[PDB]
Amino acid sequence: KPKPPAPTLTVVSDVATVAMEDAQPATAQGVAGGETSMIAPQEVYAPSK
Amino acid sequence: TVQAATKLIEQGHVRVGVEEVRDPAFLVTRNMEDFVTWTVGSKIKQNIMKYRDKLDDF
Amino acid sequence: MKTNFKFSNLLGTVYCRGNLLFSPDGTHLFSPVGNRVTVFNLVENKSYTFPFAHRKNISRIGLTPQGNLLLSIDEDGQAILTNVPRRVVLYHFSFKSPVTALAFSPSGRHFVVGLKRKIEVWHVPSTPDTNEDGDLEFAPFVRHHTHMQHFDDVRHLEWSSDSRFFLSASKDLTARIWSLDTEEGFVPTVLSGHRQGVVGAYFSKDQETIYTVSKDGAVFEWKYVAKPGHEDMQWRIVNKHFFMQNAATLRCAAYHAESNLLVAGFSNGIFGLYEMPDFNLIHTLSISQNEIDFVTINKSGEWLAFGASKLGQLLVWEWQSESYILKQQGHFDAMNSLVYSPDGQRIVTAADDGKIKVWDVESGFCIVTFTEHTSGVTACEFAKKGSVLFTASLDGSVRAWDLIRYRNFRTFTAPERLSFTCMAVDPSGEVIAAGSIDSFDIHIWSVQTGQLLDRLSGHEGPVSSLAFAPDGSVLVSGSWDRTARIWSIFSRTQTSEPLQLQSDVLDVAFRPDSKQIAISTLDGQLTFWSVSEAQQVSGVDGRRDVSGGRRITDRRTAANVAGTKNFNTIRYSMDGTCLLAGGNSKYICLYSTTTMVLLKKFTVSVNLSLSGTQEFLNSKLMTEAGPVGLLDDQGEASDLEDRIDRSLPGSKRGDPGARKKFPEVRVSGVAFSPTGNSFCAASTEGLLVYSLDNTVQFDPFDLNMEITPASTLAVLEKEKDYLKALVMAFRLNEAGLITRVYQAIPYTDIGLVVEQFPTVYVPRLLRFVAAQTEQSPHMEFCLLWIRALIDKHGPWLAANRGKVDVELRVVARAVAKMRDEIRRLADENVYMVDYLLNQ
Amino acid sequence: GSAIFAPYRTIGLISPTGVPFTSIPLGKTTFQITTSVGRALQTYDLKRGLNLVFVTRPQTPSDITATHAWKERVYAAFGDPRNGEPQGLWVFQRGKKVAELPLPSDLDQPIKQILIFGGWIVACALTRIEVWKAATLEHYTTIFPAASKKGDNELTGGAINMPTFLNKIFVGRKDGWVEIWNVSTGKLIYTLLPPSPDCGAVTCLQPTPALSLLAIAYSGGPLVIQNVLTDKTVLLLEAGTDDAPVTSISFRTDGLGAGQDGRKDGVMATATSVSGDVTFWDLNKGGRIMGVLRSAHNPPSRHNIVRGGISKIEFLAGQPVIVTSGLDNSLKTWIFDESPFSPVPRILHQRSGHAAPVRCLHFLPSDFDGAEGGNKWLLSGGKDRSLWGWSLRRDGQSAELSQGAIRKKARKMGLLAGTTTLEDLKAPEITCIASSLNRDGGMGAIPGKQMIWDKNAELSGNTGWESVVTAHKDDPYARTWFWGRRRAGRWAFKTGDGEPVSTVAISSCGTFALVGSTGGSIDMFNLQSGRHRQRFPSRFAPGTGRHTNAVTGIVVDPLNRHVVSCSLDGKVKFWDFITGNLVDEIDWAPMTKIIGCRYHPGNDLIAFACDDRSIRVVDIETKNTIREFWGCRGDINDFCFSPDGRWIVAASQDSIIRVWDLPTAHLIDAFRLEQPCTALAFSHTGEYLAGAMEGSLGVQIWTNRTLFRHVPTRQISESMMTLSLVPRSRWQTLLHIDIIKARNKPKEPPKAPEKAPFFLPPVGQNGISSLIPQETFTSKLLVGGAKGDYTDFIEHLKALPPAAADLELRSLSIGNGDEATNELLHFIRALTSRLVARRDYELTQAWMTVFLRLHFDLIMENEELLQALGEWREHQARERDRLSELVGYCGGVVSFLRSPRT
Amino acid sequence: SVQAVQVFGKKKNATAVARCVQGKGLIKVNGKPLKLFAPEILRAKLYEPILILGTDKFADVDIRIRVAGGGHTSQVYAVRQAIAKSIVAYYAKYVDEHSKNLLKQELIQFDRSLLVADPRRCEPKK
RNA sequence: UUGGGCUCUGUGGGUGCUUGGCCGCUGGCCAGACCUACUUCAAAGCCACCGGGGGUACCUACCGGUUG
């Protein structure tokens, strides 16, 4: 039995999927690949009270 | 006797889960004592079925 | 289908116990894995693998500085040389020693090799590539000089730049200078003075000073000056200094002589580099927790290459830019499972070490690592979208990643803490099915909300392998309670139908036509059922059809031996007509699903480090001390970090000590590919990616007697009956000809020929247009093709929809590549330019 | 010569000439036994088994008559000058020539033997001795013996050396005389005659271990040993008959082995070449006989095909081994023991080959892709009735296949001394073989020993059963063979008709084996059980497809669906296997007569050799002929496809090999051979081709120069918006080159010291990279814009690496504000030009996006570019409209096809 | 030596031991022969394995069968099962395993129960 | 098919792609030969695995002192 789940937080950035990947001379990803921000519009903003 | 048990599992009639086991230090935790049983094509298992008279040849 | 799968490339393991190389062109990287050598072309992201495969693992890789020729040597000294640009293997040759040291002269006329003590220099062989009217010789090498002037292991050799002298750096604190041929004003000479054996020794550019770099981190520069008493001169040291690495030795040492700068990697996994003749420290950094096994340098001298043995951990480091060129990490405990992607582009693996990683098929790289799980990671799967991935791992968490934002947008866990051995997902991308091994219950969670839905139950044992029928109507379980179990869930009754078997289950599969299931049980036989009428329709007993055995400490005969006689994992053909099935064995089997006979049998590995790769061991391996591959050879190690054994007594599964000398070969997973034509197998040789071999084999479809390539060209050019030419070209089924005519015909008659084309041939046609759309640059033309094709044969295509399933998928991925490839840029550019036009 | 194959090796042969072998001791341990293949020399270690140490390259243009071994080197005299062939003498060392020698010009004599001593080398040709200084390798002089008779002058016997004499050699004559020659000044110094001149011609002579004591052997029957300085007889032996002359002897030099107690010394061995039995004398009391190794080699016979006869015998020095070789391709070694005293020795190595030309050849299929490949085991069925698993890899793991204890059954019969012969006791000469190794489990297949050819299943069905079927000459049984145990197996089927077997093929699954009779019966056995599954036909019209004529050329479709039967006369019948019935016949009866079939799996291909000198290839899936090849002028001997399907190769009786490129239906290769080839074969990797000739025993093996180097031969004989080839990767990193640099930075930074060493040493090519090729790209663009053709600058922009490209594009400007000066505007014009040329749309949009991204402010600040911008915009609008319309249309309808039912 | 195959078959509470060895060819039940032991209508259900298999298979071996437990129709299905698993096991262990696999194909494709005592336990609709 | 058979016990190749035996090795030696000379200058540092709790007078390691 592994362990009870202890809650863990982990931060992500605003930079892109290419920043998430590892290191290599090319990005594999396409051209529309790269301009996605790793977070969602919700994350950058939602209207709220 | 645990000597003769070592001899068996060194020849390899003794399965765990679904694998066979050679390493005679495979520390059987309590969830696996219920599972560690005899292997597929074993003269031993066929001997047991011989004595208790169900010896399926299939 | 056309089932002739020659060995296409290795993949997913990235460095073995070996020596790195550059093409002299400065772009391609040679590196050894297992017993094959892969090349990474760096400029275009590409990799491939040669068609040879030694027996033992690679130990040395040397190149001809011309570039075309390669010699790679294994442990125990077996040797193979190949021509590179035409990737064929030329020769096999046996040193009588287990090789350690190797270098070719820059002149490319001889090479030197250092065996355990003996030093050798042989010629280079005249290649059939190089002579105009040439042949394979019998004895391809001719042995020029030997040298027994030397007292221990000979661990590095290096030529001069004028290809006339060479340096031998020993393991007995000595170096020696050696003449190629008998010079006049010369004596072959020694150089001594270190404290722990030298690793490198090299000439200067102006070949007067020579450097040595010796294992306790002591670099000595030597000049040939007079003795301190002034005809009489002497090789002595002009000066010396030490790397100030506190607490290790260096193992690896290399140095560019043109640009006069030196690099040294140490046991603490840091390396440094230095502007040499003045001895200033350029910089240094730590790469990896383990250590450095080998360093080598660009021919131009811009790039540095590190190979770290104990992990994957290749990295190539540009130094003056203080930047990585690449940082790759092949796995380091075995691979429990894998899948392809519904892209078809790339495949995802999940190891038992803790990392999961996404390999690209082209360009040999793990594009992505995730390390969110803390334990061994069993099975991995894809929802039909191919953008969400599901892993299930021993820590008790089913993690659910997204792959277009790269984050685990859920995790799951059972209430009482369990350890999922197996899982899958509904192809909806909406429901996850997991199966433990502690509690037998099979859980089902909602993707869209995450909170638990239903603990299915019914099982007299742990549930062993799970899958959804690809339509999504049926969940199928197999458990070790001798039983397989049809769970129909999404019906309003959530019903269950049993299926009694003969013994325990091991792996399940479906047919893309969702009517048929294939379950692979423990006696080893496959049983094939139709789902609706739950009746068994076929069976294959394949025990002798898979037994290959005789491991170390396997004291049954290779025939009798238990536990190598079952398929650990089967998988269906994308065309839906052939099983593939591999497991704890030596062999992968390939079965016909209807005729039930064996199509094909592949061996997984020729290697001999691994145990079960040959079904009989040999007498002269066996000693009066048991098998020789059981001696705890740890005592004869030079490093304390290699003398310790931090092992565990008796852990088969994940134990960090990694005693790991001589392991098994288990075909732990297989997977076809969603473009057909290729499949793969996850093994502890890394990962092997087989494909069909079309172009190397002539195959007529249904030929005639009058259809020659010249006949096709004639009716193409003079007669110009383009339809007839095309159908003859496909009928002949050869790549270059079909290419030629396809390029030839006009883009106005295209509608004519496709409207008159025959629909039996049309799917193979679709495939060919897909290949052209991808790799040939005649894009707009290929698009006119695909337009006319579907516009002419829609309702027939929609009528079958399944008999062409791979052709559909490949054309869809092709126009997706084109789509995301160009039209984003087109729209973005016209929008931007419209804006700046409008101020 | 050939335009494809180069003769790589005459494999399968150890000693086919009468040639005296040679053996140089080495170390205190090892011996080199070196014999002539017949084109090159070969050397064999003795201690490391008899594994092939060296072969010689290049081969010589003639037969090799003479060879000898000195310090390490081997001297090879070749060439019969009396008939055309040029001759000569070469020095190899480690198998490559290190020297040649000057020969006498006036040398019309083939050269018998070489002999090396003092510092001189000695050549005995036919009647005339030449000598060389071996130190400088120079012809010293030439010796000539004289006689009254052209009989009497002939240099037979030989010429050896007295162990301790000085520069003297010993020659024997055709007359019974022996002549001592001081070779220093070239002077006949003594002559000796034999007692009882009824003895005719000295046959062989050899110096004893004793001092000054020589053994001359006359054809007339006596041996004699003499004090070669007192010329007194020491021993005389009636040791040969006038029919059987002693032709090579060798003395033991050990110290023990005589006097009926093994302790005393003086044992010698004598050999003829009219028998194959060697003889051992104990010299001690008066020279008694002590024994006969009866039939060490095969006994020679003139009426028999089986070659025999014994070449030479050496007692190697100091040790009781004694090496024999004969004619029949066999090199054996024998040894005396001690503690049982042995009159005759026992065998302690042997290496053999055939005794006749190789009749059939067959590569073994792939050990799937494992250790073999396909090219390790070439199987040879040989007219001395054997079957040989040849290695091509390690030529000491080639093993004969045993038919059971054939040698023992002979020696308990009487076939050895003098009712048949040994090859008659074997199984008869082999017609054609066929194999599989799906289920030959290697060695421990069926543990315990199992009977042979006799006419249980848990244990077989675990490991592996018989795997190589073989049809013999005239026996209506068809034999089986284990391949895992190298031995004969336990099944030997009849025909059902009783007629002799014609051919036999085997399943893909290795289970079934079908035999093909000359009566027309086609029977099927299940091999593992020795049983009889299906007869063809069993019991179009069922129960009737019976072949009238001989059935040659069956093969299994690899699904076990069809069998395909080839009659001798007439027709090919595809049978439904599992029924046992005729499905479809095709008929070429009234014009042709098919002799054989070759089948290609994986492509559903059959080839037929038919008696009109034609080869008809039919694709079995479509049951109609696809090719018919017309090249043969002789009767087709053998023919086989290469596993690519690209070639079909044949050699007829016309001593000519032809090769057709199959799909092009053309004649690629054709060449002539010294003997017509009697069996070709092709390995399963496309690499090697095997062939066997007629008369020489042992095969030739060729490689595939087409596979290794591109050969451009095809000589039929008689006797619209495209893109560019840029790595899409390369422009992909060009598009995104900021963030890839950000990620290829490491997270931890390197540890620079405080005193950073300024002015890092120069790298790359001249301070810049190695990937920028070498000849002011500003000058390039400006000169294209001064001109109109931007193509040089453009292909150069293709020719940049990504970082240099990005750097070049960021280093653009307006400059002086004059119209001709702005990199920006002229770049825009370049892109327009590329678009209207419709060439590099991809790279166009790429450079467009990046350039706009990095120049937006200035081009907003100006408008003199913006007009050409709008022109570009229009062209872009048209092109993107057309293209995006096409691609979106297509991708959408393809989605709709993949998933219609929503 | 003397070949032996000893097989089981089973149903709700019948138990069918059957031994199959080399012989003339007879087929027996408890000590009485085959066409006689039954509720005299179900003898087709007894015959079914011989009639799928063709008797030219069966003319090698001898099949004793014992039975007990349960009612008639239980016994009957048991005997057909032990017949079949008998003759396929004897083909497994003393003639070619290829004839085993082909025979198993004929049998299973006819019906499953003829080789597998696929039993009935209780699991309704939960 | 003019002896048969079991069982045991030796030797030889094989059971991994064929480049020689030896030595003070660019040569020699396999019958071996010569056998002891020659010298400017000791050293750079670090780490280096015994099962847990426990006592510690003596030995030791260290750290800080003290006279001479």
Short mmCIF file of N, CA, C and O in Angstrom, two decimals, chain D residues 433-470:
data_model
loop_
_atom_site.label_atom_id
_atom_site.label_comp_id
_atom_site.label_asym_id
_atom_site.label_seq_id
_atom_site.Cartn_x
_atom_site.Cartn_y
_atom_site.Cartn_z
N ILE D 433 17.02 -31.96 -51.82
CA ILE D 433 16.69 -31.83 -50.42
C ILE D 433 15.74 -30.69 -50.24
O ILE D 433 15.55 -29.87 -51.15
N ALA D 434 15.12 -30.63 -49.08
CA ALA D 434 14.27 -29.50 -48.75
C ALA D 434 14.14 -29.48 -47.25
O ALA D 434 14.11 -30.54 -46.63
N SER D 435 14.02 -28.30 -46.68
CA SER D 435 14.20 -28.19 -45.25
C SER D 435 13.24 -27.20 -44.65
O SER D 435 12.57 -26.45 -45.34
N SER D 436 13.28 -27.15 -43.34
CA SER D 436 12.58 -26.12 -42.60
C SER D 436 13.23 -26.11 -41.24
O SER D 436 13.75 -27.14 -40.82
N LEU D 437 13.24 -24.98 -40.56
CA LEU D 437 13.57 -25.06 -39.15
C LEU D 437 12.67 -24.21 -38.30
O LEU D 437 13.12 -23.52 -37.40
N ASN D 438 11.38 -24.33 -38.52
CA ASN D 438 10.43 -24.02 -37.47
C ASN D 438 10.62 -24.88 -36.24
O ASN D 438 10.55 -24.36 -35.13
N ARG D 439 10.83 -26.18 -36.37
CA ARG D 439 10.81 -27.02 -35.18
C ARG D 439 11.96 -28.00 -35.07
O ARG D 439 11.74 -29.16 -34.72
N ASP D 440 13.18 -27.59 -35.34
CA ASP D 440 14.32 -28.42 -35.00
C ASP D 440 15.01 -27.86 -33.78
O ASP D 440 15.87 -26.99 -33.91
N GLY D 441 14.70 -28.40 -32.62
CA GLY D 441 15.04 -27.77 -31.37
C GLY D 441 16.50 -27.74 -30.98
O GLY D 441 16.81 -27.69 -29.79
N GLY D 442 17.42 -27.77 -31.94
CA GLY D 442 18.80 -27.88 -31.55
C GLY D 442 19.04 -29.26 -30.99
O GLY D 442 18.29 -30.20 -31.26
N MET D 443 20.07 -29.36 -30.14
CA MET D 443 20.62 -30.65 -29.77
C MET D 443 19.63 -31.50 -29.01
O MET D 443 19.05 -32.43 -29.58
N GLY D 444 19.34 -31.15 -27.78
CA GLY D 444 18.54 -32.02 -26.96
C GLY D 444 17.11 -32.01 -27.40
O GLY D 444 16.23 -31.52 -26.70
N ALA D 445 16.87 -32.52 -28.60
CA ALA D 445 15.53 -32.50 -29.15
C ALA D 445 14.72 -33.64 -28.59
O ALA D 445 13.70 -33.43 -27.94
N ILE D 446 15.15 -34.85 -28.86
CA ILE D 446 14.47 -36.04 -28.40
C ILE D 446 15.46 -36.83 -27.56
O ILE D 446 16.19 -37.66 -28.08
N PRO D 447 15.53 -36.55 -26.27
CA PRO D 447 16.60 -37.12 -25.45
C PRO D 447 16.57 -38.62 -25.44
O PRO D 447 15.57 -39.23 -25.79
N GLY D 448 17.69 -39.20 -25.11
CA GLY D 448 17.90 -40.59 -25.45
C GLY D 448 18.18 -40.69 -26.93
O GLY D 448 18.04 -39.74 -27.69
N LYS D 449 18.63 -41.86 -27.35
CA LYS D 449 18.95 -42.02 -28.75
C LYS D 449 17.76 -42.64 -29.45
O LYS D 449 16.99 -43.39 -28.84
N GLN D 450 17.57 -42.27 -30.70
CA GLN D 450 16.39 -42.66 -31.42
C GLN D 450 16.79 -43.25 -32.75
O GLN D 450 17.74 -42.81 -33.39
N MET D 451 16.01 -44.24 -33.14
CA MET D 451 16.36 -45.17 -34.18
C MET D 451 16.49 -44.46 -35.50
O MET D 451 16.06 -43.33 -35.67
N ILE D 452 17.11 -45.13 -36.45
CA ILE D 452 17.43 -44.52 -37.72
C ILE D 452 16.63 -45.16 -38.82
O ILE D 452 16.79 -46.35 -39.10
N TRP D 453 15.77 -44.37 -39.46
CA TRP D 453 15.23 -44.67 -40.78
C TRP D 453 14.39 -45.95 -40.75
O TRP D 453 14.64 -46.91 -41.46
N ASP D 454 13.35 -45.88 -39.94
CA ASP D 454 12.67 -47.09 -39.49
C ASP D 454 11.56 -47.56 -40.41
O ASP D 454 11.14 -48.71 -40.27
N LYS D 455 11.07 -46.72 -41.32
CA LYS D 455 9.96 -47.06 -42.24
C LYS D 455 8.71 -47.55 -41.54
O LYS D 455 8.45 -48.76 -41.54
N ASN D 456 5.55 -41.44 -29.60
CA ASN D 456 5.82 -40.54 -28.50
C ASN D 456 5.66 -39.12 -28.92
O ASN D 456 6.15 -38.75 -29.95
N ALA D 457 4.95 -38.31 -28.14
CA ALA D 457 4.74 -36.95 -28.62
C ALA D 457 4.74 -35.83 -27.60
O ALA D 457 4.88 -34.69 -28.04
N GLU D 458 4.60 -36.08 -26.30
CA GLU D 458 4.73 -34.99 -25.34
C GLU D 458 6.10 -34.37 -25.44
O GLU D 458 6.24 -33.14 -25.52
N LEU D 459 7.12 -35.20 -25.57
CA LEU D 459 8.50 -34.76 -25.47
C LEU D 459 8.97 -34.11 -26.77
O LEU D 459 9.61 -33.05 -26.75
N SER D 460 8.61 -34.69 -27.90
CA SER D 460 8.86 -34.02 -29.15
C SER D 460 8.10 -32.72 -29.23
O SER D 460 8.69 -31.67 -29.51
N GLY D 461 6.81 -32.74 -28.91
CA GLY D 461 6.01 -31.54 -29.02
C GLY D 461 6.40 -30.47 -28.04
O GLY D 461 5.92 -29.34 -28.15
N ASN D 462 7.23 -30.80 -27.07
CA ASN D 462 7.88 -29.74 -26.32
C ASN D 462 9.11 -29.21 -27.03
O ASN D 462 9.31 -28.00 -27.11
N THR D 463 9.97 -30.08 -27.55
CA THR D 463 11.24 -29.53 -28.01
C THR D 463 11.30 -29.29 -29.51
O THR D 463 11.46 -28.16 -29.95
N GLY D 464 11.18 -30.34 -30.32
CA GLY D 464 11.43 -30.22 -31.74
C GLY D 464 11.77 -31.50 -32.51
O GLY D 464 12.57 -32.31 -32.07
N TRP D 465 11.15 -31.70 -33.67
CA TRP D 465 11.31 -32.93 -34.40
C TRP D 465 12.18 -32.73 -35.63
O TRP D 465 12.87 -31.72 -35.75
N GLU D 466 12.18 -33.72 -36.52
CA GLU D 466 12.95 -33.72 -37.75
C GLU D 466 12.72 -32.53 -38.64
O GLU D 466 11.64 -31.96 -38.66
N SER D 467 13.72 -32.14 -39.41
CA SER D 467 13.59 -30.87 -40.06
C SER D 467 14.16 -30.77 -41.45
O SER D 467 14.06 -29.71 -42.06
N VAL D 468 14.86 -31.78 -41.96
CA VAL D 468 15.41 -31.67 -43.31
C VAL D 468 15.14 -32.94 -44.06
O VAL D 468 15.74 -33.97 -43.75
N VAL D 469 14.25 -32.89 -45.04
CA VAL D 469 13.88 -34.09 -45.77
C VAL D 469 14.81 -34.18 -46.96
O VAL D 469 15.32 -33.16 -47.44
N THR D 470 15.02 -35.40 -47.46
CA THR D 470 15.97 -35.60 -48.53
C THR D 470 15.51 -36.74 -49.40
O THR D 470 15.24 -37.83 -48.90
#
